[PDB]
Amino acid sequence: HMLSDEQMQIINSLVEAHHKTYDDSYSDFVRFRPPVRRLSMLPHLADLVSYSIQKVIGFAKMIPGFRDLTAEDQIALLKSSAIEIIMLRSNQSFSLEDMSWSCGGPDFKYCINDVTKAGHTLELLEPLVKFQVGLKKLKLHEEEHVLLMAICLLSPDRPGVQDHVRIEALQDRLCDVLQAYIRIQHPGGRLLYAKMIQKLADLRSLNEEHSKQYRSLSFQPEHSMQLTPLVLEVFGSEV
Amino acid sequence: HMLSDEQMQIINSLVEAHHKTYDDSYSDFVRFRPPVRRLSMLPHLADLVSYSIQKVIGFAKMIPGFRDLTAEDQIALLKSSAIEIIMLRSNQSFSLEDMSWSCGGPDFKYCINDVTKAGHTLELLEPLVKFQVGLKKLKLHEEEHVLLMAICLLSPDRPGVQDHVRIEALQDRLCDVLQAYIRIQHPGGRLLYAKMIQKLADLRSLNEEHSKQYRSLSFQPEHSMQLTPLVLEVFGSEV
């Protein structure tokens, strides 16, 4: 059993898209508002997120079939999935030795107490770091990593999506490429696919905790004035 | 002829308010998004402005009688006058030797070509720098400087102000303290007061050029996403 030419064409599209939208140098982090260690870290992490949303948008525009959805559907998927793809792509900088995200230098290494200084409580961040270690232990290939993002993003069980059936089609067609890639190209991966779908379920639970805490934060203007226009728009509500 | 105890009480209030809302160290400028030398300078200057608006708000809350206006009137005066008080208070860092604003170090020295890289054309910036040199040549005392701000801000000829007569009262009562301070405490100032009112008229002409160019800029989301929530709100239109 072997992968069709079009599922490689897909795999190729998804990894080139990820490489275009992900800077392994983290050299744009100097252009954020600097970190400061209430809510000292909120400015710097608000730009970090806003920047990442711009990257997630560029990645989605390159998933096959995404461009051809209606702009309303594209917005609904992005608004609902944005924080999830961020939690996913962020694993690439996460590291088990420091149990933090180590980007660029040490001014850009965010342990759990940095994110608390951006206005978040441990019941978001413990399942978050555990998500990231559980997923770091799954030791995904680059191909499974970009697939899991593309899949999470093209999920039709989102609030507000219209052409439900078409997205479910495209999502499944990407799940087939994944499950097929693990069987052929990943030794020891006969339990992996189910472990990935379980990570998607954890992403949902995180999504909701984060959406709740951000709500509390965005309704206090001393703090929401620290956010960026883009963040406010994507995590906002008036759709 | 000599100044009443209440006009000193006013002068005292206005300079202590200015000293509370103005950092001569410019040491908070490191917390802005760094300058970069399209529109490279827009992020750093957008935070510069947003920060300054926070300072102008703290200053107005300390002008005598301002707290007692209705919150709608306070908003209307701030929204219409914000960019003017910024152009005024900014003279304190402006310098004739460099013909730029030299705050803190040299990363925070803004010549005219820096502000062009934040999306503004010379027909705003030449009358701006000329405003600043004409006003730098008037060599105001600290007392006349804070007065001219308090006066510019409490002007009732603003779009959207309600209790017109009360603001005109308070503005005039501050003009009397000014004109009286120059006669008593400023030698050579028998032409000064009229020169100050003429600077208020230049501030209006600047206000409109800036309001026009910002309009063009705020209607392009690649650029307005660089602004801050506060800037968007104060220079916006939905009042």
Binding site: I57, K61, A71, I75, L78, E233, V234, V239 | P221, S224
Partner: peptide, 10 residues
């Protein structure tokens, strides 16, 4: 709304 979002998507 989604002025910025819609434009980033071209």
């Amino acid at each position: 709304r989604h002025k910025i979002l819609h434009r980033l998507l071209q």
